[PDB]
Amino acid sequence: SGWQAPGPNDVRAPCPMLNTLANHGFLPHDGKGITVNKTIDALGSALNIDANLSTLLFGFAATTNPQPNATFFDLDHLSRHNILEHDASLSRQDSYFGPADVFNEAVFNQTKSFWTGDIIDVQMAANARIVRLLTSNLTNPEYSLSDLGSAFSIGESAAYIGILGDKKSATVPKSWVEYLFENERLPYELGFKRPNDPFTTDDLGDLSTQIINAQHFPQSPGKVE
Ligand code: HEM
Ligand SMILES: *[C@@H]1O[C@H](CO)[C@@H](O)[C@H](O)[C@H]1NC(C)=O
Ligand SMILES: *[C@@H]1O[C@H](CO)[C@@H](O)[C@H](O)[C@H]1NC(C)=O
Ligand SMILES: [Mg+2]
């Protein structure tokens, strides 16, 4: 009850969380025809994300619809390389190697190795993201990261801490994050509960700044902020 894997005509994204919300039915289970109202309602219902942040994210999502000026998106639209989808994902391979939409065990094994305790803090999240950037740059001859892709990468690490975890301590249990990625199901059984405080654009901004502040390069190699 409450969760179903995708079937052959369902579409999924490179986003572990939208995929999770489609699997649960917060978003349409076939991943299609997502409007601004469905986004607001789904992200508010499942996660207590506020309307303004839901609206901002929807605005970006709509840009990936191949129809111009679209009022909806489908989850597979989000997989279009170098619009929102970017290299040096935590759990997906770069498009250069293979499809950048589905979970990739090799890549996620790398990310997990930088999550060094049972509680993920801002330092571990920043560290895991950095090694993905450097690893893609040195292994992918087509490696790219746009100013928008960089902002998204930083915000994705901020998101799993603040939306799945405790945005005030800026910590999240590692098992919860691993479960979300590996199952695209919410880790309710491991203790996750929908937060009572809405998650805002300013919350995401605050955690994003913390991520950048936890980066200690002697000299930044390329697009790291
Ligand atoms: C309408 C809302 C959203 C849209 C349009 C969106 C879109 C995306 C896209 C396009 C990616 C792929 C970027 C890449 O190449 O890694 C992504 C990744 C991600 N998203 Fe979402 N997302 C949304 C909401 C959420 C929420 C609510 C969370 C909460 C935890 C979330 C967490 C993440 C994480 C952690 C990743 C990184 C995956 C990885 O690096 O393997 N997203 N999202
Ligand atoms: C990922 O790590 C697991 C856990 O040790 C291992 O069994 C698996 O083969 C690894 N996968 C890759 C592709 O490295
Ligand atoms: C990849 O690394 C080089 C440093 O060799 C840097 O000039 C380049 O900006 C990096 N690319 C990205 C997209 O960060
Ligand atoms: Mg990617």
Automatic annotation (TrEMBL):
<feature type="binding site">
    <location>
        <position position="89"/>
    </location>
    <ligand>
        <name>heme b</name>
    </ligand>
</feature>
<feature type="binding site">
    <location>
        <position position="86"/>
    </location>
    <ligand>
        <name>heme b</name>
    </ligand>
</feature>
<feature type="binding site">
    <location>
        <position position="85"/>
    </location>
    <ligand>
        <name>Mg(2+)</name>
    </ligand>
</feature>
<feature type="binding site">
    <location>
        <position position="15"/>
    </location>
    <ligand>
        <name>heme b</name>
    </ligand>
</feature>
<feature type="glycosylation site" description="N-linked (GlcNAc...) asparagine">
    <location>
        <position position="109"/>
    </location>
</feature>
<feature type="glycosylation site" description="N-linked (GlcNAc...) asparagine">
    <location>
        <position position="137"/>
    </location>
</feature>
<keyword id="KW-0349">Heme</keyword>
<keyword id="KW-0408">Iron</keyword>
<feature type="binding site">
    <location>
        <position position="91"/>
    </location>
    <ligand>
        <name>heme b</name>
    </ligand>
</feature>
<feature type="binding site">
    <location>
        <position position="89"/>
    </location>
    <ligand>
        <name>Mg(2+)</name>
    </ligand>
</feature>
<feature type="binding site">
    <location>
        <position position="90"/>
    </location>
    <ligand>
        <name>heme b</name>
    </ligand>
</feature>
<feature type="binding site">
    <location>
        <position position="86"/>
    </location>
    <ligand>
        <name>Mg(2+)</name>
    </ligand>
</feature>
<protein>
    <submittedName>
        <fullName>Cloroperoxidase</fullName>
    </submittedName>
</protein>
<keyword id="KW-0479">Metal-binding</keyword>
